Each structure stands twice: as C-alpha cells, then as structure tokens.
Design a binder for this molecule. Sequence first.
Ligand code: CL
Lengths: 144, 144, 144, 140
Amino acid sequence: PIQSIKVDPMKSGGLGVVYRSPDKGRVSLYLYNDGEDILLVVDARFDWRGEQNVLVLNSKFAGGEWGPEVRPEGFPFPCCGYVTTITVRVEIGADGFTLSANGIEIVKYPYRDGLPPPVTKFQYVFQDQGASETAQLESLSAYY
Amino acid sequence: PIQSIKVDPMKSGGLGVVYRSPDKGRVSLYLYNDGEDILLVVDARFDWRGEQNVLVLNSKFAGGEWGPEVRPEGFPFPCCGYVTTITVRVEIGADGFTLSANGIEIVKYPYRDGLPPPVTKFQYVFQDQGASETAQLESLSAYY
Amino acid sequence: PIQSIKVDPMKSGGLGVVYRSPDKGRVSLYLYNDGEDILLVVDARFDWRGEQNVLVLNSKFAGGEWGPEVRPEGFPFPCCGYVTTITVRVEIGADGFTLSANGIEIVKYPYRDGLPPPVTKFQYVFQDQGASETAQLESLSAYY
Amino acid sequence: PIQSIKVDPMKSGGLGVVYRSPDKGRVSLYLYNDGEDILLVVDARFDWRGEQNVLVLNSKFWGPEVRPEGFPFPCCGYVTTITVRVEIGADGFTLSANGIEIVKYPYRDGLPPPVTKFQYVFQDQGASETAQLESLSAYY
Ligand SMILES: [Cl-]
C-alpha cells in the first residue's frame, strides 16, 4: 500500500509507476526533496470524500499548507467501477513536471515557489475507501 | 480506420493490438478463418447506437447471423469522455479464446459450434459516431 | 522456422520482430511488395557459410539479380556462442528504411530505384547450420 | 555513471536495470542492505583488466565467485541495450537478462535480504562507446 524509492538528487529524467487501480480510494504519488517538502503530489481520486475520478495536482513545504489544487482532464479513470493497469510517468523538466499516463501527456505543472527539484524521493500511497478491489503496486522506476 | 494482418493458420499463440481509444464510435477486432467466418469479434462500444462503454463478443459464419452476445465486464473504457492507450490481447487456447486488456484477463470464450481455429486473419475496425477524438491504431501483433 | 504477416499496403510506420537468436545459422527478415520483389532483406548471420556475426542488407526484383550489398556494424550478435532475445525494427520512412535492433538505430537505407514501398508482407526465416540452440520466433508486428 | 535507488527493505519482488552497454570497462550491479553489505554484485566485465566478456557474481560484508554463462555480451566492437532483472526469491537471487534466466544464487550466510539498495556502476577502461544508464526499477 506504501512504497518509496529514494534517488540520488534528480534534476532531469523521469519517475514512473505501474499499478492496478482500485475501484475506491485514492492513489497518491509524492515527489519529495530532503527537506521532505512535497514538490508535487499526483493524487488520483477513484472515489474519495464524495469525489469520483478526480485527478488533483499540488505542492507544499514540509510543515506547511496546500497550494491551490490543479485538476487536469484526461487521466484514464476506468468507467463503471472497473479496474485496470495504469502506467504513470512524471518528467522532471527544466520548466516544471510533465505528467503522462499510458504514454499520453496529461498536464505540464510549473515548479512552485521555493519547491523546485532535485527530487530525492518518489512515493506511492494507496488509501482505501472500503473498495471491493484494492490497488496493487507493480513497479516503481527512475528514468535517467 | 481499417487495418489487418494475415497469418499462416494459427491454432495457438496470440493476437494483440494497441490503439488510442476514441471518445465515440466503436473499435471492433475480428478474427477470421480461411472461409471468412468470424470466429470472434471483440466489439468495444465507446458510444454506439445509444450505448456507452459496452463490450460485445460474438461469432457468426460469413453470410450468416450473429449468435448469442456475451457482454463481459472489466474492459477498461475511460470515464468522462476521456481517451487512453488500450492494449488488447487474444490468446488462442485449446477450448476457446482468452481476451485480456492491459494485461488483465477479461473473459474466456469457448469456440462456437463449427467456428474453431485456425485463425488466419486479425483485423482492426474503428467506426466513428461523430467522435471528437477518433481512434488511432498503433500496432497489430502476432505472438507465437 | 518460417513465419510471415501480410499487412495492407504499407507506406508508413514500421515492422517488428522479436526472437530468441540461434547459436549458428542465419535469421533473415524479408520485406516484399505485391509483385514479390524483395524491397529489403535484413540478413543476420550468426554462423553462416564461412561468416560469423555479419549483417547483410539488400534489395532485388522478383526476377533480377541482387544489388550492392550493405554490411552495417552494430548488430547485437552475442559473443561466445550465446543466445539472447533480439528485438528488431524496420521503419518505413519517406526516403528509405531505418533499421534498429534493441532500440538502437543500426543503419538508414535509401530505397533502391524501382523498389520503393508499399510493403505488403514481412517475413522471418531461420535457416539452421547445426546449431545447438536454434532460433525461436516470438512475435511479428506492424506499427502504424 | 553511478546511480542508486534505495527502496523500503525488500524480501520479495525484483530489481531491474536497463542500460546501453559499453565496449570496454565493466558495469557492476550491487545489492546492498542498510550497513552497505554486498548481498550480491552482478559484475558484467565487457573489457576489464585482461578479461573480456565475463560475468561474475559474488557477495561480501570476498568469497567464492560464480561465473555463469549466457550473459548477452555483444560480439565485435558492439554495444546494445541490455535489460537485467534480479528476483529476490526465498532461496536466493535469480538473475536474468533480456528475458532469459542466467542463474540462481542462494543467499550466503550472514547475507540475507532485505535489500535496501540497488546500484549501477559503470567503470570505464578506454571505451569508444561508454555505458548509458536508462532506468532503474523496483518490482513489488
Ligand atoms: Cl454488425
């Protein structure tokens, strides 16, 4: 349900994850620096606090408050309560993060004030909301 | 919008397709014998004849009539009018075909009476129903 | 040891193979048009009629003689009589083929005059020469 | 040419690497615990001090060295993409390359999982084509 890989400080390249989606709950991906600031959360809400199939991007300092949510369209939430295998990729660009899902680009996310790279940790968190089918993590990768 | 591969008669291995889903229309995959009978259609209805996110599998002889529809759950249609990359595979087993999408097994389908392998041809067909994102075929594969 | 796909007339995309290499003998990939001209042969000689670890490309008319033979470097022939899986890809570009193996571009190859695409058939052929490990075909693909 | 991923300690699953090979030098893959013990190194010697195209496995805190056949060192001057996978099984590591099993390596006393670190290290020895790391993976 929770796994991380820590990388040698990363200012370019990509982080990827493959997982089987849950019918309920949320899958969260956290990109941290050593300060443990959240440079980016990619928070895919399957069914979460009354929201269905909602993707949320945000950042924040370690003991800190969420910035504004961004909510892109195009994340491959399966219909009808189904589940599937999802591959997600975060490019660490000069500009900001680039998020792709199944090789399709979802959103460009410019780096937030005082939170640019290097990334040093990439974390998967599945949180349940009484799902019939819970998320299964298959892999975590760093792309150089 | 229509593309096929022709193979030496296959009685095992697999046929795969990758494509970018459409927001409307249907993507059907046809597996034929040398007689041009349809041993199997894998009919992914994204938005077709007032149906939405429906998978239909059936068989019929060349000029004949469709037999009994099977409508399995789990095919990973995207929510919300979104598109994604879908990988589908059909194994040709001893007793039936095994259909999988994104590496997850969808259903097993016993060969219909007098419609057994060998498969000799595997064809992708997308038919529009005024989609704003039309299907894009990426590849067709034969597995030994 | 011989397998082929016939595709619809292809002026675009690519064609792929995946196989487990032989410790001797040759593996040839032929690209035909409808007339059965050889628009390209990618002939990988592991141990063949005097030669070891040599790559040969040519084209010929169905009738006629060969052309000037090109022998690129870079083809991943394994050392020491080992075998491995080889992935090979032939892009059908505007001006010639591009050959790659395991994702590394091996050579570009301008179309011989009188022998441009459409390509209508991609064929794999293994010919033994007393291998302790013969080749095994894993897949053939058309990319659009 | 040195990279690592540190993972929450793993007693099952797998570690993968993809890189483009060098024509000289060695690329070495290390599996470490918390104390930097070498639970296993997979040392692909393309051209390394007299040895050519040799695979070497071992562990340390040296000890007996295994030398499996079948690792896909390319012939001639050549380089390619290589995909190596190491499974953390119950009996030991299982190592494969380009989808093919190369050998099984029982854990050695004092050196069991969990694995906390997987590290790639290319050391050059005059290569005209240097190694290029492409990705490092953990499988769960
Ligand atoms: Cl119909």
